[PDB]
Structures are given as C-alpha cells and as structure tokens.
C-alpha cells in the first residue's frame, strides 16, 4: 500500500552513490588503516567526513566504497554468525507457576539467577560474588526444561537456546567458532540467558584409544572452557548446563569455577506428587468431591512425565466407557493403564543413572 | 641414544662458551642420568644456572652441575620410549 510514501525519497538516498559500500574488516590501526576486503585484498585508507577517530576499532567490519576506497559508516562485528541468530526467542510459554508444587529446585534457582538480575543491589551490601553457573540434570521425564523456562519468563530478556548437537558442525574446527558466537552476543546484549541442551553429546572425557576419529568432540569443550574461564575471567550472564547423562560428562565439568549451585531433581514423594494433580485439576474436568491424594498414593515413585499422563488419559476413558466427565472410576482405570499397562519400557524408573 | 663415550663429547660443547670452573665434571654426568633422558643434555645447562643465583656466584658449582643432572630425571615424565622406530 505505501507505494508513493517511499519513492519520493528515491531521488536522494538512492540515485546518488552512498550506501553501495564494500564490506571489509580492518586489521591494523595507525594513529593509516589497513583493511582487508572480503575478496582477500588489502589497502590503506583514512577517516571519512562523518567518521569519528574513536569509532574505528581493531577487528571490526568497516564498509568501504567500491570505486575509491574510503571509510564511510562502521558495521557491527561478526557478520559470519548465522545459525546463532535464530537461537534468540521472545515471550516463552511455560510461566513461573506452571511447575507443579513448590520445592527446593525453584527457590535455589531464583536466588542465583532471578535475584541478581532483578535486585542487583541486594548482594552488593555484603560484597559477595553471585554464582555464575548452575547445575540441573536429574532423571529425565521430570520436567527439567519446564523449570528452566520458568526463569526466562521472570527475566524478560534475551534467551539463548543452545542444543548439544549444535556445537558439532559439518566442518572440523567450525565447532570452536560456534562457541565464540555464543559469548560474543553476551557482551553485545547484556543481561541475557544462555541454556545448554544435552551437553552429553559434547561434554565428556573419552581418553584416547578405541576410536581414532572421535577427537573432534573433546576439542569443543576445551574451547568452551577457555571461552568460559580463560586467562582473563570474562563473564557477565548466567550459564545453565543441562543434560540427561551426568555420569558420562567431563569429571572436570562438575568442578567449581564454572558451576557453583548444584540442584539435582528427585522423584516427588506423596506430598510432591499431590500438587502435580492439583495444578492439572484446574484444567480438563474434575468431579466435585474427588480427592487426588488417594490417586497419587496408589501410584509409586516415578518421573513427572507419567504423572501428567494420568490426567490426560483420564479424559480418554469418558469416550470409550460412555461417561460425561472424568469420574473416580476412570481414575482407577488410569492407574492400571498409565502405570500398570506401561510397565514395559516407556519409562526410566532408575534405569539411566550411572550406566 | 649415544653411548657412554658419545655423551662425554657433548658436555664439553655446552660448557665451552658458558663460564665454568676448572673442576667441571667429566665422566660422572653420564653416570648420574641413565635411562631418564640420555638424549638432550642442554636441559642440564639451563638448570645449573639457577643453583648459582641462590648462592650468589657467577661461576657454576661443579656439585650444582651434578644436581642439575639429577633434577632432569623428574622433569620429563613424557614416556616416549622408542624400540619400534628401528625399521
């Protein structure tokens, strides 16, 4: 629709030659600027008309004119990162209250992450150092990522999603570049959150012999550790490591200096599993007078994934058994279905812990 | 690895331009390090300079020269034993 609202300006910013600049990176600063083109060509230029002497810095993309090379406008550094530009999300789904029950996992994470971001002056009175990293592993199916997304909602800032399979690329040595792409945006965008997903595919100690082609995996963590704690302790944002195989990780990865607060998820007890059915009681259909504490007692200790499956499957009996809403009789049938019927695999139940 | 007579000629090489004392050891340096290194002697020449600084002496103590050779035994710990590269 706005066809004529633009071309009116097409006789100034377009017909004239200003914008068509050749993107290139500056190397040495003599205060003579040595700049290397993307075509692999080097030259020397000076300042521009509107160019300030303090704007040009070492290792930064600087657009230069194609005909007569001169500095006109500076460009943001690191134009090469591409995939990491899609890792930024906004307005997640799971809220802070979506986690079933109030336990130690919620209170310990909000103090080391949400507290220093919302109240930076609280810990400044005692003059202490808030923990940079955290630890969440636990058994699978417990809603580990559900608790991690509850923190991103209260933060209201940039959330960086990092998949463990993203570190390994299709080129040897590219994995080291993917690590620096994550920490470069930490300085550009302050007070953000980065989250690792399934670091077991990368993080670990494989020693030497037995493969011969697997040395590409261990070189990613050695760069990740350097980018985390290097010769210069550079860091701002909090770091979250999450994987389902804690025993196969790097034995140095669990040491202090990166992760401080260690919180391991546990199987909810009768009091813990009771709130799981209560937070789901507001949804679906619950008959008046049904006590969910008796349903959770018949169910033994298991992961939270099977707990939410009870309320979901309970609504499925009303269609086959010819029922209006979910009754207590259909709840007992879900015990023999969600639990007793699925006792063949489809569960962890102290399966993967060490081996 | 040189033999017992081959190493003896090398100690005079590193101690030639380096200022020494006329008591500088001859054949005992070979007997001090056996099987630990037996290859790179120049490590011993660097370590011998630190013992003379603590005693405030420009010349190297012949006893400190033997102590520098003994120190090299624990310096490497790199394994690297070669019986397989003959062929």
């Amino acid at each position: 629709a706005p066809s004529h609202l633009w071309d009116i300006m097409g006789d100034r910013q377009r017909l004239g030659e200003e914008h068509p600049l050749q993107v290139a990176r500056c190397t040495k600063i003599i205060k003579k600027y040595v700049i290397n083109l993307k075509q692999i060509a080097k030259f020397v230029v000076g300042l521009g008309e509107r160019v300030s002497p303090t704007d040009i810095e070492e290792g930064m993309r600087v657009g230069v004119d194609r005909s007569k090379y001169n500095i006109e406008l500076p460009l943001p550094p690191r134009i090469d990162p591409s995939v990491t530009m899609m890792t930024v999300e906004e307005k997640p789904d799971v809220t802070y209250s979506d986690v079933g029950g109030c336990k130690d996992q919620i209170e310990k994470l909000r103090e080391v992450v949400e507290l220093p971001l919302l109240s930076p002056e609280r810990f400044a009175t005692l003059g202490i150092d808030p923990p940079k990293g955290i630890l969440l592993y636990g058994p699978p199916g417990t809603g580990k990522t559900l608790c991690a997304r509850a923190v991103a909602n209260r933060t209201d800032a940039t959330f960086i999603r990092v998949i463990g399979s993203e570190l390994v690329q299709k080129y040897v040595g590219e994995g080291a570049r993917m690590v620096r792409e994550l920490f470069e945006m930490a300085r550009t965008k302050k007070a953000c959150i980065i989250f690792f997903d399934e670091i077991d595919a990368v993080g670990g100690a494989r020693f030497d012999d037995g493969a011969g082609g697997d040395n590409e995996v261990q070189r990613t963590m050695l760069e990740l550790i350097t980018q985390l704690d290097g010769f210069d302790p550079r860091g701002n944002i909090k770091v979250m490591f999450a994987t389902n195989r804690p025993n196969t990780l790097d034995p140095a990865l669990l040491r202090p200096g990166r992760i401080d607060r260690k919180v391991e998820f546990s199987l909810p007890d009768l009091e813990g599993r009771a709130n799981i059915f209560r937070i789901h009681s507001k949804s679906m259909s619950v008959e008046r007078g049904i006590r969910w504490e008796l349903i959770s007692r018949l169910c033994p200790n298991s992961t939270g994934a099977e707990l939410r499956s009870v309320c979901t499957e309970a609504g499925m009996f009303a269609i086959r058994a010819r029922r209006k809403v979910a009754t207590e009789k259909d709840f007992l049938k879900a015990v023999d279905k969600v639990i007793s019927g699925y006792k063949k695999f489809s569960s962890t139940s102290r399966y993967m812990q060490y081996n | 690895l040189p033999n017992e007579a081959g190493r003896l000629e090398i100690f005079k090489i590193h101690t030639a331009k380096v200022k020494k004392t006329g008591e500088f050891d001859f054949e005992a340096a070979v007997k001090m390090s056996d099987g630990f290194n037996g290859a790179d002697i120049r490590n011993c020449a660097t370590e011998a300079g630190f013992f003379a600084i603590r005693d405030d002496r420009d010349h190297i103590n012949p006893d400190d020269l033997m102590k520098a050779v003994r120190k090299v035994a624990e310096v490497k710990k790199l394994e690297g034993t070669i019986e397989y590269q003959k062929l």
Partner: protein
C-alpha cells in the same frame, strides 16, 4: 598487562617461585645470562587438577613484567580453512619480532596433539598441522629467550612426547592440592570483600577443608554469603562457612549393597 598481582594469592609461593624463575628472573637477569652464556628456559609446563590457580598464577606474573602479552588458545588453532591455523602460530611469533620482550600463553596444551596411525580412521591431520608449527617456529628464528611461552594443560596423560625439549619447555611445574597453611591464606583473601564479625578462625576451617583445589576454595566464600542472604543475616558467622562446605557429592547417598 592484567590487573592480577601476587598480593591477591597466598600459600602458592612454592609454585610461584617456580614461575618467577621462568618469565620473571631470566628477563631482568638476562644481562647475567649473556655474560655467563647460560640459555634461559624457553618455557614452563603447568598441569594439575583443573580447579587450581594456574590461570590466576600465570595472570599475576604477566602484570609484574609490564610487557606485551599475547594469548593464544590451542583449540582456536584448528579451523575449517586449511592453513589459517598454521598462520596463527606463524604470526604469533611474528609479533615477537617487532616487540622482542613479549609473553605467549597457550591454554590446554593437551588440546593439540595425537599419534593416530595404526588404528582405524587414519587419524585426522586437521590438528597436527598447527602442532608442527609449534615445533618448527620454536626451532627457527625464535628461542632467543625473549619468546618464553607459558604452557598450561590439565593432565600429563595424553600429550605428544615430542613437545618437551630444552628449546621449548624446561621447568615442569607441578600444582598439587594446597596444604593446610596454603588453603588458609587463599580462603582469607576471598573473604576480604565480605562482611563478618571477625570471629572466624580459618585455622579450623583449613582443616575442615580436605584436599580442595583453588576453585573449590573460592566456592566456599560464595556459598557462605548465600546462606546468610537467604536467612536475613547481617553478617556471615563461622557456622555459615562450615555449612557451605558440607555437601553430598562424592559417593554419598548409596543405593549400593554391601556396606554393613
């Protein structure tokens, strides 16, 4: 130069004096080595548990020299473009020409090296390329004892046996776990920025800490402040340090049989 000095560390003087004889004394005493003809050590090997102060100790020595510092990571030497990583080591010592008294630091020396001949996969060779540059450059115009490099690695188990020579790395500096008096001075420095009642005796806490590295000691003062923060305490007492150190980890919470 960095902002770290020797005053911020304590109890490591046994390992510090080994660093003073590498990049510190041979630089100022070079006039003595030229008259004596003794070649300064080309470098120093650093290993141990990863939670030590090897990053802090090497940082405290760089500021006292007041010279140009160069940081080069070993995993950064491998790139998808062939020859780009080979030019990194080649251009790293090229800056040691224009500026002769410089300092080069290599983190995670075990990151670059291997054998990989006999067994399957025929190796990689996208790594050892930049490793041959470390052997060739240090045997080239370098090794004037102004090129001294600080080599920091984790363990000694997996490494190229050809990395150690009188022209590359001489003094092998072991970093064991700090002792009683060594941990007492480290824990006291990290608590200087906190607020306490001055009733804490670190001699008892030094014995409460059993075989902890430099990183495990820093986490003590971090958790000690978190205990008084959640309880609403105005100061950190001695009981907060004992409670902060105690945690499961280890083998505790055993589902295993036997015991008895």
């Amino acid at each position: 130069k960095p902002t770290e000095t020797y005053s911020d560390v304590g109890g490591l003087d046994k390992q510090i004096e080994e660093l003073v004889e590498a990049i510190v004394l041979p630089m100022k005493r070079a006039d003595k080595f030229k008259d004596m003809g003794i070649r300064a050590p080309k470098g120093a090997l650093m290993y141990g548990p990863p939670g030590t102060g090897k990053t802090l100790l090497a940082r405290a020595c760089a500021a006292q020299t007041n010279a140009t510092f160069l940081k080069l990571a070993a995993p950064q030497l491998v790139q998808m473009y062939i020859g780009e990583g080979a030019k990194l080591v080649r251009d790293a010592f090229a800056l040691a020409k224009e500026k002769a008294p410089t300092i080069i630091f290599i983190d995670e020396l075990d990151a670059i090296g291997t054998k990989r001949f006999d067994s399957e996969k025929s190796g990689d060779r996208e790594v050892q390329r930049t490793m041959l540059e470390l052997l060739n450059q240090l045997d080239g115009f370098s090794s004037d004892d102004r090129v001294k490099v600080l080599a920091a690695t984790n363990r000694v188990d997996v490494l190229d046996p050809a990395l150690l020579r009188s022209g590359r790395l001489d003094r092998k500096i072991e970093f064991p776990l700090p002792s009683e008096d060594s941990r007492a001075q480290i824990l006291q420095i990290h608590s200087r920025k906190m607020t306490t009642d001055d009733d804490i005796n670190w001699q008892e806490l030094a014995r409460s800490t059993d075989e902890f590295n430099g990183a495990q000691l820093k986490a003590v003062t971090v958790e000690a402040g978190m205990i008084a923060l959640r309880n609403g305490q105005s100061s950190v007492k001695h009981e907060d340090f004992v409670e902060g150190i105690s945690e499961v980890q280890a083998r505790k919470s055993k589902s295993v049989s036997f015991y008895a």
